[PDB]
Write a protein that binds this ligand. Structure first.
Ligand SMILES: CCCCCCCCCCCCCCCCCC(=O)OC[C@H](COP(=O)([O-])OCC(O)COP(=O)([O-])OC[C@@H](COC(=O)CCCCCCCCCCCCCCCCC)OC(=O)CCCCCCCCCCCCCCCCC)OC(=O)CCCCCCCCCCCCCCCCC
Ligand SMILES: CCCCCCCCCCCCCCCCCC(=O)OC[C@H](COP(=O)(O)OCCN)OC(=O)CCCCCCCCCCCCCCCCC
Ligand SMILES: CCCCCCCCCCCCCCCCCC(=O)OC[C@H](COP(=O)(O)OCCN)OC(=O)CCCCCCCCCCCCCCCCC
Ligand SMILES: CCCCCCCCCCCCCCCCCC(=O)OC[C@H](COP(=O)(O)OCCN)OC(=O)CCCCCCCCCCCCCCCCC
Ligand SMILES: NC(=O)C1=CN([C@@H]2O[C@H](COP(=O)(O)OP(=O)(O)OC[C@H]3O[C@@H](n4cnc5c(N)ncnc54)[C@H](OP(=O)(O)O)[C@@H]3O)[C@@H](O)[C@H]2O)C=CC1
Ligand SMILES: CCCCCCCCCCCCO[C@@H]1O[C@H](CO)[C@@H](O[C@H]2O[C@H](CO)[C@@H](O)[C@H](O)[C@H]2O)[C@H](O)[C@H]1O
Ligand code: SF4
Ligand code: SF4
Ligand SMILES: [Zn+2]
Lengths: 44, 144, 95, 95, 114, 52, 52, 342, 208, 178
């Protein structure tokens, strides 16, 4: 019986190739709101 | 908790080489103090260890002997000191050590390995292996 | 075997050896003449002659595809052996 | 793999990815370094019959180039039909 | 025996381009010697220029003299722009090469070559 | 790249200059178990591109 | 067999160093797309032309 | 000739010249020029060395593959000297120091070591022995080194009667201790010259000519047993030479006289240096011992070498002693020195 | 269907013959021969005077648009009087086709430079001049490109020896890299490989 | 099919919600903080380094390394001086001479590989009809002189005897692919 290197029956599972850089972080208001809070408390 | 398990393995590695002398000897010779399983040893004194939980490339390693062919190799270890039976296992060209799959014996195979002899008085020196081609005339040894 | 010349240099299996007055001997000063000590001529002579029944026998050197190309040797000349032209093994007919 | 679960959370969050699923290092999923022997198949001309070489010889089907012009109304032509414009990818047209 | 000209229509119109190249090479020796910090004198450099121009003193085909002038301008440019180095300029002077004797006996003693 | 050099070596025996593609085909057939390793590498490679 | 494997060609819009960098990065992803197909569509057979 | 020494080729590196020379002292200033000339024509060269291997690296590229053989030797051990001169058809002795060390004095270097080499070369069956000495070598010499050279010549010719003796004057080159020695006086503001340098005559010779005539003696049939005087083509008063050197380096020349005994005492201080002395008493003496007139001795031209003027080659030695303002000044900007026929 | 012999196609060879006649009708002043190989590649062989007009028409004509100069190179055939065959490989992206335009030259008959047609050619014509010594008129910057500075000769000419005439080494006497006549420890061994039996009856030459 | 890498001008309108996001991106260096995060994650990954010379990089049985001359199980040389390795060598790296031996055998009196001409292509391994010349698995044989890299027959037979135990097993693991 021929024994050659071949893919398994059905084939290989899917391979990710598309860009996948996640979207993450606080909102624009939250960043500014924290920073402006830190100044105000520091000025006080 | 996990941090303690880490310190457990750390202690177990510090004390797993047989004393303080053992730990210093391995640490300053190989800069590594892992604990592998002794797979075998050779006629020269190299010891072969493995840990299949390590990632491919660190799952096999050798602690070279400290004296080979009369040379002092406590500090001067080079990769040419691994004989050919283990050279194949150590380089992952196979999967079974010579302690279980010995090489076929031959009467001409070197019994004693020899590492890189460059720079030494044993070093190879090239030369022509043929014999003289043109033979010159030899004059008579007597007057005429 | 590894004969030694009168000059003290070892003679290789091909019979080469620098003369006494050949300057080219200087390359071995403080070094060595690489010589292979297992003379294949001496090793092949040690093998016993395989005896076979038929008059024509095929030699491939052993190992099948790991040997040499398969050839056949006549065994009629019942005074000398048949020699393989590749591996140098000898054969002789049983009767 | 040997990393504690605390450092896994730290570096998954710092990267913003799930590193543990796709490690750069290789462990057990690699192939065994000693595989069983292969048994490779022959080709389509390993027949014992109906396999004359002259009927499957490519080097001999080559001929010298056709000479269209030399020293020895008609519609205008292009070197080939115009290329078709490529279509935009349906998988992901705008990366 | 009729052929397309390159630049010159006959040897006299080509020698005009030769002398103009020799002028340029002559003006540039004192700079090459100064910029490349060569260990020669200007007179010795200029003599070498003259020696190379006389190496091709037998050429008569006008097309050939066009392509020697074309090459010589390329050589001049490689030197003015310092694309060449001391090693390259100094190769003209064959300072490491022992010169083969031109007499029969010396050749005969030295080997089989003519 | 060190891992892709391993696929070059497992088919040809050289990390770079494989001399493996030849007029008429390829020199030797894939060793058994090579497509698994190429697949194992490929499933993870897009994460590497993501990090860059 | 490039006329049997499916993939997209990345194109740029400004023709500067940044678009070329994005094209190369997107080509590496498209090579990954091709490799997955080769691994499943690899057929059996000889490797050099059956003509000695 | 043995069949392995017949000369083939065209005198390139891959040719065979038929010369198998052991050069003793190849690791010095004149040594690299002797090996290069031997090596470039395709000669086997055996190079005995006592220094570190790092110091013989620049010689490795002087011969084709196989044409250079480096050997470790100790001048005290005879057996190592035999080991080197054993396979040669010529032995060239260039051993020498300009100063004395703890372990080797001028007698050792200039008498015993040359005799040890010549004695072993005669026993080994070497056809030619080339021994370098000095032009002003003489037993009635002020310089302690120059008397030993005179003795050494005679020892060499007692045990090797047919030895060829080479007597160069001061050798000047890129690594010499001659033009680089005076160019370095600038570090001391002024130039102390005994009698202001007007009584001393010098006829310096270019190193490549010395080395090119030494190699030409390895093959000249009419050289066995002769003594040669290798000298430049021009004699200069020391003052004019030292003045010319500073003209070539464009440094400020401020010469003043200094009596030989005050100058000799300074050289003793610099000789206390544990390293390589900047100067010594013997080096100060030799600088002012005047070159002998050439009277009946074959010179460079009898070995097919045309002496190179000090003017053609000074700038390659002295350009590195200039400042940025003068690096590019050409040879012509310097007025040539004045020669003397006595 | 033969699993060892290259598929032959059919339409492309017919198309390139039609365009080859097209080009020859339009540029009869320059075209000397038109052929299409069994690989299906169109070749136009022109008189060297026709280079610039021929590549200009092929670039700007609407039913051609061979806008890319894939490469430009020479072949040295010493038996010919005009020993240098100049080859232009052009690419049409509009029609997804290729075309080869060939002319010739000798040692003393320079070709016009097409730098006015294809800027791509600028360095290609420097390489032909350097390697084969074929001069080009009107080149903006004709000078060596691939050989060492002050290298004498044109090393891709068939009569130029493989190892050349000079070699370099460092000379410690003069303290620089010097050039000297070539001597090899081992000579390049020439192998006579040609079989004395004819392999292709289709290319046999008449014994006239 | 084609895709756009750097096209996105399907212009949207800048909401106050979105403008404040662009500003926080610019003022707070948010994307530059993301990059700092990626290198921080790598700090706590295990390094890919191996502990050479005590650990070795993986190799396959086909690995083309140092040359060697093999023998038959009886100790007879396999090489029959056919000179096919010499005719194929792309680098003209092999030099061979031969003559009848004392027993009449066809054997080489010379066999050199100038390992500084060799390109380690392995073509000689393919051309040899009797598996006499092989490229062993050794790769750690750097020397301190050029001349030591000109291998004559003795040196190559010595490499054969040195490495045979390992060469034979690599051929055993690969000859069926040949
Ligand atoms: C004061 C501190 C500064 C001084 C520096 C020296 C002290 C080192 C730091 C503290 C010890 C931590 C080491 C450890 O975690 O053990 C694991 C480690 C072994 O565990 P492992 O198998 O690698 O498993 C950990 C995972 O791989 C990977 O595990 P991980 O990456 O997930 O991290 C484990 C843990 C570790 O983080 C911590 O710091 C705790 O991190 C955490 O879980 C979070 C931190 C809380 O232990 C060691 O390797 C011991 C190294 C030291 C041996 C010394 C050899 C003798 C030499 C003597 C002569 C020369 C000495 C130098 C002369 C100067
Ligand atoms: C310097 C001080 C300036 C203040 C830094 C504040 C950074 C911050 O708040 O996180 C920003 C970033 C979120 O990623 P972002 O680019 O905003 O994605 C769009 C989401 N609207 O945050 C992140 O992406 C987290 C990056 C990894 C964190 C590890 C580095 C610490
Ligand atoms: C020298 C080498 C550096 C020395 C210092 C190393 C200190 C090692 C021990 C630190 C232990 C930190 C515990 C981290 C706990 C954790 O799992 O992280 C998770 C946390 C976010 O949680 P998560 O669920 O992933 O996401 C939800 C987001 N709201 O993520 C976080 O909030 C973590 C943010 C702080 C992490 C600081 C650790 C980095 C230390 C390196 C400093 C920079 C060095 C340059
Ligand atoms: C109550 C009253 C309140 C009053 C106070 C209000 C304060 C509001 C907050 C303001 C914060 C200002 C911080 C400075 C921010 C800044 O200037 O960054 C912008 C700068 C410009 O980058 P650019 O390419 O030009 O993009 C924008 C186009 N102009 O981009 C940059 O700066 C990038 C510089 C990055 C260089 C690398 C440095 C490493 C960063 C990581 C270290 C983090 C610590
Ligand atoms: N101006 C000149 O250069 C002149 C030179 N000469 C003579 O020419 C010869 C060489 O001149 P130069 O090249 O300047 O001399 P160097 O100062 O260059 O030293 C020459 C060699 O002598 C070797 N040497 C010295 N002492 C010993 C020792 N005890 N054992 C072994 N080797 C030793 C050195 O080897 P290492 O470096 O390892 O010590 C060095 O290679 C000498 O005889 C010198 O007197 C004659 C006239 C003028
Ligand atoms: C009262 C004060 C009077 C002034 C002092 C009298 C002058 C005495 C000093 C003269 C100059 C000394 O200058 C010294 O010259 C010697 C002779 O070459 C050099 O000597 C050394 O130089 C380099 C150093 O690697 C070597 O290559 C060279 O072969 C070696 O001789 C020194 O590098 C230099 O420092
Ligand atoms: S590996 Fe290639 S280059 Fe090296 S000896 Fe064999 S055929 Fe020649
Ligand atoms: S090594 Fe093999 S190919 Fe080379 S000569 Fe010997 S038998 Fe022939
Ligand atoms: Zn047999």
């Amino acid at each position: 019986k021929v024994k050659q290197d071949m893919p398994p029956p059905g084939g290989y599972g899917p391979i990710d190739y598309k860009r996948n850089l996640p979207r993450r972080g606080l909102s624009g208001y939250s960043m500014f709101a924290v920073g402006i809070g830190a100044l105000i408390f520091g000025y006080w | 908790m996990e941090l303690v398990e880490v310190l457990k393995r750390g202690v177990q590695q510090v004390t797993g080489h047989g004393g303080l002398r053992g730990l210093l000897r391995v640490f300053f010779r190989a800069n590594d103090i892992r604990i592998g399983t002794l797979v075998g040893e050779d006629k020269y004194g190299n010891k072969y260890y493995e840990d299949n939980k390590q990632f491919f490339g660190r799952h096999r390693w050798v602690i070279y002997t400290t004296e080979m062919n009369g040379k002092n190799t406590f500090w001067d270890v080079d990769g040419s000191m691994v004989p050919p039976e283990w050279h194949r296992w150590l380089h992952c060209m196979t999967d079974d050590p010579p302690t279980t799959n010995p090489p076929t014996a031959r009467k001409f195979i070197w019994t004693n390995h020899k590492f890189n002899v460059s720079a030494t008085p044993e070093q190879y020196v090239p030369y022509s292996t043929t014999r003289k081609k043109i033979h010159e005339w030899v004059p008579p040894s007597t007057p005429y | 075997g590894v004969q030694v010349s009168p000059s003290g240099e070892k003679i290789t299996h091909t019979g080469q050896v620098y003369d006494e007055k050949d300057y080219r001997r200087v390359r071995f000063v403080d070094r060595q003449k690489e010589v292979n000590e297992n003379f294949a001529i001496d090793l092949i002579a040690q093998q016993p002659v395989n005896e076979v029944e038929h008059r024509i026998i095929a030699c491939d050197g052993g190992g099948g595809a790991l040997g040499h190309p398969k050839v056949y040797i006549n065994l009629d000349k019942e005074t000398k052996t048949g020699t393989c032209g590749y591996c140098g093994l000898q054969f002789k007919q049983h009767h | 793999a040997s990393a504690t679960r605390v450092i896994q959370k730290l570096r998954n969050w710092a990267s913003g990815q799930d590193l543990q699923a796709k490690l750069q290092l290789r462990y057990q999923e690699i192939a065994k370094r000693t595989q069983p022997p292969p048994k490779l198949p022959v080709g389509p001309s390993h027949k014992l019959s109906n396999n004359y070489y002259c009927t499957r010889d490519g080097r001999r089907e080559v001929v010298p180039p056709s000479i269209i012009m030399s020293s020895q109304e008609k519609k205008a032509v292009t070197p080939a039909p115009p290329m078709k414009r490529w279509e935009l990818s349906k998988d992901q047209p705008y990366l | 025996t009729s052929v397309k000209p390159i630049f010159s229509r006959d040897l006299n119109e080509a020698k005009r381009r030769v002398r103009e190249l020799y002028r340029a090479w002559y003006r540039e020796v004192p700079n090459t010697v100064h910029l490349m910090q060569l260990d020669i004198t200007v007179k010795q450099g200029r003599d070498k220029v003259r020696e190379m121009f006389m190496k091709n003193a037998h050429v008569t085909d006008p097309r050939v003299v066009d392509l020697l002038v074309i090459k010589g301008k390329m050589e001049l440019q490689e030197t003015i722009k310092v694309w060449k180095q001391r090693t390259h300029v100094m190769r003209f002077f064959h300072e490491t090469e022992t010169p083969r004797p031109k007499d029969f006996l010396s050749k005969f003693y030295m080997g089989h070559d003519p | 790249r060190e891992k892709m050099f391993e696929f070059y070596e497992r088919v040809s025996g050289a990390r770079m200059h494989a001399a493996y593609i030849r007029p008429g085909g390829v020199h030797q057939d894939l060793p058994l178990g090579l497509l698994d390793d190429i697949y194992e590498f490929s499933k993870n490679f897009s994460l590497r591109i993501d990090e860059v | 067999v490039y006329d049997q494997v499916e993939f997209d060609v990345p194109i740029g819009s400004r023709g500067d160093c940044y678009d070329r960098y994005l094209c190369r990065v997107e080509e590496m992803r498209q090579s990954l797309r091709i490799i997955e197909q080769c691994l499943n569509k690899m057929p059996p057979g000889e490797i050099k032309v059956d003509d000695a | 000739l043995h069949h392995a020494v017949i000369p083939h080729g065209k005198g390139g590196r891959s040719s065979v010249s038929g010369v198998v020379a052991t050069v003793f002292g190849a690791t010095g200033f004149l040594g690299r020029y002797v090996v290069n000339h031997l090596g470039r024509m395709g000669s086997q060269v055996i190079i005995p060395y006592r220094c570190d291997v790092y110091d013989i690296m620049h010689l490795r590229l002087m011969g084709d593959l196989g044409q250079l053989t480096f050997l470790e030797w100790d001048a005290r051990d005879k057996d190592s000297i035999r080991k080197a001169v054993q396979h040669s058809n010529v032995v060239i002795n260039l051993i020498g120091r300009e100063w004395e060390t703890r372990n080797f004095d001028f007698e050792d270097v200039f008498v015993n070591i040359p005799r040890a080499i010549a004695q072993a070369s005669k026993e080994a069956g070497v056809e030619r022995f080339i021994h370098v000495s000095h032009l002003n070598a003489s037993m009635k010499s002020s310089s302690k080194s120059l008397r030993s050279k005179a003795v050494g010549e005679k020892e060499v010719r007692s045990v090797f009667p047919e030895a060829i003796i080479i007597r160069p004057s001061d050798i000047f080159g890129r690594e010499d201790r001659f033009l680089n020695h005076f160019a370095n006086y600038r570090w001391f503001l002024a130039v102390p010259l005994v009698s202001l340098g007007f009584k001393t005559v010098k006829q310096p010779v270019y190193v490549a000519d010395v080395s090119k005539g030494i190699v030409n003696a390895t093959k000249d049939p009419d050289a066995v047993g002769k003594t040669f005087a290798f000298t430049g083509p021009n004699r200069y008063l020391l003052f004019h030479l030292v003045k010319y050197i500073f003209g070539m380096t464009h440094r400020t020349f401020i010469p003043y006289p200094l009596p030989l005994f005050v100058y000799s005492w300074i050289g003793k201080l610099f000789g206390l240096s544990p390293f390589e002395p900047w100067t010594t008493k013997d080096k100060v003496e030799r600088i002012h011992i005047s070159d002998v007139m050439p009277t009946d001795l074959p010179g460079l031209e009898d070995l097919g070498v045309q002496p190179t003027p000090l003017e053609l080659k000074s700038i390659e030695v002295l350009r590195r002693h200039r400042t940025y303002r003068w690096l590019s000044s050409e040879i012509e900007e310097t007025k040539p020195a004045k020669t003397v026929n006595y | 269907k033969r699993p060892t012999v290259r598929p032959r196609s059919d339409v492309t060879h017919k198309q390139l013959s039609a365009f080859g006649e097209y080009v020859a009708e339009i540029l009869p002043k320059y075209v000397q021969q038109v052929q299409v190989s069994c690989l299906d590649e169109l070749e136009i062989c022109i008189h060297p005077d026709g280079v610039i007009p021929t590549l200009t028409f092929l670039r700007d004509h609407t039913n051609a648009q061979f806008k890319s100069l894939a490469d430009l190179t020479a072949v040295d055939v010493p038996t010919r009087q005009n020993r240098f065959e100049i080859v232009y490989n052009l690419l049409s992206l509009r029609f997804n086709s290729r075309i080869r335009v060939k002319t010739y030259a000798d040692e003393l008959t320079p070709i016009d430079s097409i730098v006015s047609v294809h800027i791509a050619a600028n360095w290609y014509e420097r390489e032909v001049w350097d390697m084969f010594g074929v001069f080009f008129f009107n080149h903006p910057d004709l000078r060596r490109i691939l050989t060492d500075y002050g290298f004498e000769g044109h090393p891709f000419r068939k009569d130029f020896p493989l190892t050349g005439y000079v070699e370099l080494r460092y000379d410690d006497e003069v303290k620089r890299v010097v050039a000297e006549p070539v001597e090899l420890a081992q000579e390049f061994r020439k192998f006579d490989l040609n079989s004395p039996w004819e392999a292709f009856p289709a290319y046999r030459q008449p014994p006239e | 099919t084609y895709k756009y890498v750097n096209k996105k001008e399907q212009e949207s309108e800048v909401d106050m919600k979105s403008a404040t996001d662009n500003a926080a991106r610019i003022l707070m260096w948010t994307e530059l903080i993301r990059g700092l995060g990626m290198t921080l994650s790598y700090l706590f990954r295990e390094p890919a380094t191996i502990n050479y010379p005590f650990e070795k990089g993986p190799l396959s049985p086909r690995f083309r390394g140092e040359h060697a001359l093999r023998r038959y199980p009886s100790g007879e040389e396999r090489c029959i001086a056919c000179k096919l390795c010499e005719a194929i060598c792309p680098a003209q790296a092999i030099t061979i001479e031969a003559e009848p031996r004392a027993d009449g055998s066809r054997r080489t009196t010379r066999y050199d590989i100038d390992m500084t001409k060799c390109i380690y292509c392995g073509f000689c391994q393919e051309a040899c009809p009797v598996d006499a010349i092989v490229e062993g698995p050794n790769f750690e044989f750097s020397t301190e002189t050029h001349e030591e890299l000109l291998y004559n027959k003795e040196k190559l037979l010595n490499n054969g005897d040195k490495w045979e135990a390992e060469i034979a097993a690599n051929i055993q693991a690969d000859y069926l692919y040949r």
